[PDB]
């Protein structure tokens, strides 16, 4: 084939694997938790409605994402 | 080192010299003789190296006197050479190019990989030679024994 078509297939692979990585991160399935899995605080049922199966609060979730920003 | 050894071997205090500045001359002379004799790849003689450095000194002097640069016809009158020795001198006094020079204008090549062979006989020529041998042999067979023998021998 051509030097463009190979690049098309590689770009499709790259965007596919990215999109699947970020669909895998979202939960949308699990059992209701009723309270944080880190601090014990309650998860308000609105946030649980937005994501079925939120193992964390918003506070602990933000904290964990924020430590993970430095990738450790 | 060699020059300093010769200086030691040919020193005397009976002329009141200072040995440091005495041996400085011998050192510089021996190193000059060496840098002339065994520096160029193809070895040029001593007087030739003196002529070459004369040409370089005068080339620098003219290349800021005349402004642009001097021609051989002008060097043959600042220098007083026969106008043809200058051509031969400035032909000779240049180094050789390193045959592993990278002619990087390719995949990856070298100047050495581009110098063809000149003395090889073409396969066309070799075939023609063999054919001509055969032809002249049959021709000479197309003579008598005495004829062919004399015409081979002469």
């Amino acid at each position: 084939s051509d030097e463009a078509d190979e690049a098309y297939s590689v770009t499709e692979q790259l965007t596919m694997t990215g999109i699947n990585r970020i669909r895998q991160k979202i939960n949308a399935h699990g059992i209701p938790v009723y309270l944080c899995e880190a601090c014990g605080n309650p998860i308000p049922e609105a946030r649980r409605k937005i994501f079925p199966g939120v193992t964390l609060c918003v506070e602990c979730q933000a904290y964990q994402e924020r430590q993970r920003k430095h990738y450790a | 080192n060699i020059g300093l050894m010769k200086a030691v071997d040919k020193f005397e205090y009976r002329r009141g010299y200072k040995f440091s500045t005495y041996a400085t001359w011998w050192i510089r002379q021996a190193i000059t003789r060496s840098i002339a004799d065994q520096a160029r790849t193809i070895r040029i003689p001593v007087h030739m190296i003196e002529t070459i450095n004369k040409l370089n000194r005068i080339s620098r002097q003219m290349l800021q006197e005349m402004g642009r640069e001097p021609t051989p016809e002008e060097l043959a009158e600042r220098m007083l050479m026969p106008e043809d020795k200058i051509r031969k001198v400035l032909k000779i006094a240049k180094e050789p190019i390193s045959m592993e020079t990278p002619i990087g204008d390719d995949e990856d090549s070298h100047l050495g990989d581009f110098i063809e062979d000149t003395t090889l006989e073409l396969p066309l020529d070799s075939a023609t030679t063999e054919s001509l041998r055969a032809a002249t042999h049959d021709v000479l067979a197309g003579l008598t024994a005495r004829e062919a023998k004399v015409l081979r021998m002469r």
Partner: protein, 49 residues
């Protein structure tokens, strides 16, 4: 014909501003430019390959 997805910037992280247009329609400046990231990553890999 349909829209064309979400250009993935060469870091690996997928940009969140999708291309709500397609090739039968135009592509305004931002959208074509965002396409440029993934296009040039494809080139810079099928040049090393």
């Amino acid at each position: 014909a349909g829209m064309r997805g979400l250009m993935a910037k060469p870091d690996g992280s997928i940009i969140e501003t999708p291309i709500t247009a397609n090739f039968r329609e135009g592509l305004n400046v931002l959208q074509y430019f965002i396409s440029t990231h993934g296009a040039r990553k494809g080139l810079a890999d099928t040049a090393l390959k």
